[PDB]
Design an enzyme around this catalytic site. Structure first.
Site, PDB file in Angstrom:
ATOM      1  N   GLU A  27       0.865  -1.196   0.000  1.00 35.44           N
ATOM      2  CA  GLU A  27       0.000   0.000   0.000  1.00 35.44           C
ATOM      3  C   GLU A  27       0.894   1.235   0.000  1.00 35.44           C
ATOM      4  O   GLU A  27       1.830   1.305   0.813  1.00 35.44           O
ATOM      5  CB  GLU A  27      -0.903  -0.025   1.225  1.00 35.44           C
ATOM      6  CG  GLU A  27      -1.838  -1.218   1.235  1.00 35.44           C
ATOM      7  CD  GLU A  27      -2.568  -1.393   2.550  1.00 35.44           C
ATOM      8  OE1 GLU A  27      -2.098  -0.854   3.560  1.00 35.44           O
ATOM      9  OE2 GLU A  27      -3.609  -2.055   2.544  1.00 35.44           O
ATOM     10  N   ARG A  39      -1.681  -0.780  16.116  1.00 37.65           N
ATOM     11  CA  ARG A  39      -2.342   0.311  15.366  1.00 37.65           C
ATOM     12  C   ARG A  39      -3.063   1.221  16.366  1.00 37.65           C
ATOM     13  O   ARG A  39      -4.171   0.895  16.820  1.00 37.65           O
ATOM     14  CB  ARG A  39      -3.206  -0.301  14.264  1.00 37.65           C
ATOM     15  CG  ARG A  39      -2.370  -0.917  13.145  1.00 37.65           C
ATOM     16  CD  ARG A  39      -3.217  -1.554  12.073  1.00 37.65           C
ATOM     17  NE  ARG A  39      -2.456  -2.330  11.109  1.00 37.65           N
ATOM     18  CZ  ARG A  39      -2.969  -2.879  10.005  1.00 37.65           C
ATOM     19  NH1 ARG A  39      -4.260  -2.760   9.704  1.00 37.65           N
ATOM     20  NH2 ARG A  39      -2.181  -3.575   9.211  1.00 37.65           N
ATOM     21  N   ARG A  98       4.068   1.366   2.397  1.00 37.28           N
ATOM     22  CA  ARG A  98       4.037   0.266   3.400  1.00 37.28           C
ATOM     23  C   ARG A  98       5.129  -0.746   3.047  1.00 37.28           C
ATOM     24  O   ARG A  98       5.153  -1.209   1.895  1.00 37.28           O
ATOM     25  CB  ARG A  98       2.649  -0.367   3.365  1.00 37.28           C
ATOM     26  CG  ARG A  98       2.467  -1.589   4.234  1.00 37.28           C
ATOM     27  CD  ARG A  98       0.981  -1.817   4.403  1.00 37.28           C
ATOM     28  NE  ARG A  98       0.718  -3.117   4.985  1.00 37.28           N
ATOM     29  CZ  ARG A  98      -0.439  -3.513   5.502  1.00 37.28           C
ATOM     30  NH1 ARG A  98      -1.485  -2.700   5.533  1.00 37.28           N
ATOM     31  NH2 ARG A  98      -0.541  -4.742   5.978  1.00 37.28           N
TER      32      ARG A  98
END
Lengths: 519, 519
Positions: B374, B454, B390
């Protein structure tokens, strides 16, 4: 050219819209191949009047890396989806055809152009809601036509299908899940099934959990709306999520028809598991509490809870609770609930708790065996209790005998040998010769008949006091995956009831003729 | 004893009933201790007229084995529960008090007898639904009274709280979840946010997934009902669960205001993940398809999908798809979408796909870097594209430069050093000096500012074309756990918008003054 058919040994729910009758794999399709028509046949003696509809679905193809021996890409009818446990998920299966008047021979058609390689079809059977729980379908796929040529059919598809009823589905009455079945038959022939009502999710205590009860006066055809047998709401102004009660065990006092339910009340403990967070002491703030309710009106209404913790829990134990499922009345009128305690060293032990005074006082003596938990008890012969135990060593049930209500214990010959398990709750009951059509003393046992996972829910019968469990004296009910807990109760002289966590519903009732177990 | 206060840096949702303002741990209570009254103070310049109500909840205690450092036993307000994402789960929190007229000083009361040890309380704020997304609360717990004695308050609680809006909550419009945000601002100042609509659950393709779109003509205060930008229903008579389309990327053709959405359509693949099950080839039956829709009416209506696969996919690739989030218009009118492909050896590479003809034809040249997925792209200087990637190696973003639309690539000085990540989607945009109140070229970046998990969703600004990301030029939006994907778009000259998966909603919109990033 070659088509593979599966007839899965899973219950057909009379209260379902869709039940998987056949799964079909066409593994080597050319792009554009069409399944023009397939023919199903039903056995001559099947009650086709109870079959409401038969449907043919298409479920597309398989993922390249999942191999070629599967019968489905996904579960077609969910037992977990709180928005639909009753019909095929329409995003996984597209209806091709439907017949709503069922003959002994039945044709289903498609015009679906197949993709290259694996194509999945399946047949759904819908029953009338008043279908006899004792009714059986013997169904075969006899012809499959692809591009107007008959195809070679392969697969084991000779299974004799049984009915059941989904007494509790995921989402019912706003509850996320239902777990931990118990079942008794009252002196009035009334079936009473208990379970956790797990409102938020499916995790064990501590959580927002009540004890639910389903009542049937017609041998499980119908179930009266869910009653809450036991609840602690916002006791002491603590959240209901820190006042869960569950892992229920039910018994009928056969002398009085007083019905008793024992369960574990956890007060506080944040949002963690009681099994590792219940601590030594006696108070509700310190440790899990042993709580009891009764019904004097054949299970319609339930007493306030009484706290029997102080009578029976050793202060040094981290956790005392009932063995989930059921207890018994002995021939001499003693009431017996299986129990389990975690000792001061965090070591679990199974044993028994009994009352000689119609449930006024309760006593626990000696543990049966180290590193055991969930157990059920049967009076296998007069004054002799058989304790059948979940064993943390794996592979097989522990079996012990007491003749002195658990002051002393003896290893049974069948111990860690006769009954395979994956470390899961199991049900054991005794049936007196005079109380069943065979006219012989029975033990009946149910569990997931496997040493890995939870599947192949099987009822087993013993004629020799649980020394032997002949393979011939067994009926397979559910070969697919579920949470595995079960509880047995004789319905009448001719039929056994099983209330269990199945592949098809959180709480499944099935009825089985004793003459199907012992032929 | 000492009381501990947390002021969690998470968005206050203007559309929520409950938002966590303060978490309170009382660790060393005696049984019967009562939190009589707690006083909160708001900064002199706060707009307390947009605060509708403040509530004090009790959430009971902690489990024995979970330690003493937590501020809660469970999440109080769910972003996942399809039956309630908007108020405190009432089974975890009991309301003690509520004030509906909020002054600079505010007192909340309880009469709840505490248990021995850890007791949890928390303060909920409800905002007026019309609350300014730009408005801020500076709130402190200034006094806590237990048994009519003030207690010693400890804890970091000096956070300046920000507002946001839950554009999509779990369960909205019958969809289990929403993931993979994209955001643009049209030439009309209209905000357009795209996402997966994941109907059955939250697992990636392959599944029943459509591309949703939320439209706002008022800088995100209000959002028009969800439109379906892209869908494949029962294409070719395959189930919708084998016709998912997702991981959307949106761009505005700044020359025409034509809006473009690109997404990956998976056809078949059973119920498994496309990332490992998409195979070489070109046809829908063989491989993921690159699909595009457009809107010529500022995002109100969407063209039928066009299949772009043959224009840009190498047959030997297992999988070609857009980089989720957004694309750009370059100063010279080139439209650029970030892309990612898995080569024949299953090795992922990030790159760019561009159109010089207003989106009529698309072209891909060379990948930027091995083992990247990504990516997002910004024109950092005229004719100079920065690809921010990424990286499967972990720890930090890959950053490369092309000035030939990806025929050749150069490592940027900031590569694998300046921007930490946990291997997660991140957003990168450029803002011209003449287009923003600072009168300087900006890069703005958003991601979970951590190398593990995250959390700590943070907007970072660069004044030197992404060579440096000074700590002072950063705003923390969400310190708690989420799925981590985000997308930035300038709303106007003075404010950046962020559309992201947060701890408080599946799709969260927040607006941030540029002068908060660069002080």
């Amino acid at each position: 050219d070659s088509v593979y058919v599966q007839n899965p040994q899973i219950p057909i729910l009379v209260d379902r819209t869709d039940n998987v009758l056949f799964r079909i794999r066409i593994p080597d399709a050319t792009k554009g191949d069409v399944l023009n028509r397939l023919t199903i046949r039903f056995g001559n003696e099947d009650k086709l009047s109870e079959v409401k509809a038969v449907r043919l679905f298409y479920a597309g193809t398989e993922a390249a890396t999942k191999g070629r021996s599967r019968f489905a890409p996904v579960t077609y009818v969910s037992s977990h989806n709180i928005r639909n446990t009753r019909s095929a998920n329409p995003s996984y299966s597209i209806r091709q055809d439907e017949v709503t008047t069922v003959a002994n021979t039945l044709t289903l058609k498609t015009r679906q152009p197949m993709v290259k390689g694996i194509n999945y079809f399946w047949v759904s059977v819908e029953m009338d809601r008043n279908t006899s729980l004792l009714s059986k379908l013997t169904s075969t796929v006899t012809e499959v036509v692809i591009n107007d040529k008959p195809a070679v059919i392969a697969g084991e598809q000779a299974a004799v299908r049984r009915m059941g009823i989904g007494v509790r589905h995921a989402g019912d009455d706003g509850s996320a899940s239902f777990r931990i079945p118990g079942l008794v038959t009252t002196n009035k022939g009334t079936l009473l099934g208990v379970y956790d009502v797990r409102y938020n999710n499916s995790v064990a205590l501590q959580e927002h959990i009540d004890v639910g009860l389903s009542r049937s006066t017609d041998k499980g055809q119908t179930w009266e709306p869910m009653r809450i047998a036991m609840s602690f709401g916002e006791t002491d102004g603590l959240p209901s999520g820190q006042n869960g009660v569950g892992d229920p065990s039910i018994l009928v006092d056969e002398r009085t028809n007083t019905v008793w339910v024992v369960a574990a009340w956890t007060h506080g403990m944040g949002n963690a598991r009681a099994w590792t967070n219940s601590m030594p002491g006696m108070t509700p703030d310190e440790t899990a509490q042993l709580m009891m309710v009764k019904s004097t009106d054949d299970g319609r209404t339930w007493s306030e809870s009484t706290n029997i913790t102080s009578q029976v829990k050793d202060p040094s134990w981290c956790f005392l609770l009932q063995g989930p499922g059921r207890g018994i009345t002995m021939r001499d009128g003693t009431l017996v609930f299986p129990i389990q305690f975690i000792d001061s060293l965090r070591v679990p032990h199974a044993g028994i708790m009994y009352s000689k005074d119609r449930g006024e006082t309760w006593h626990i003596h000696q543990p049966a065996r180290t590193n055991t938990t969930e157990a059920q008890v049967a009076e296998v012969e007069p004054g002799v209790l058989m304790l059948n135990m979940r064993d943390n060593r794996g592979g097989s049930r522990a079996v012990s005998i007491t003749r002195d209500l658990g002051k002393s214990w003896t290893e049974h010959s069948s111990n860690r040998s006769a009954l395979p398990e994956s470390i899961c709750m199991a049900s054991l009951i005794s049936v007196k010769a005079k109380d069943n059509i065979i006219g012989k003393d029975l033990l009946l046992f149910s569990n997931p008949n496997t040493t890995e996972g939870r599947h192949h829910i099987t009822i087993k019968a013993s004629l020799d006091g649980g020394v032997t469990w002949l393979p011939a004296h067994q009926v397979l009910l559910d070969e697919e995956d579920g949470w595995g807990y079960s509880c047995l109760s004789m319905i009448d002289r001719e039929t056994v009831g099983i209330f269990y966590e199945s592949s098809v519903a959180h709480m499944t009732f099935q009825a089985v003729k004793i003459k199907d177990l012992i032929r």
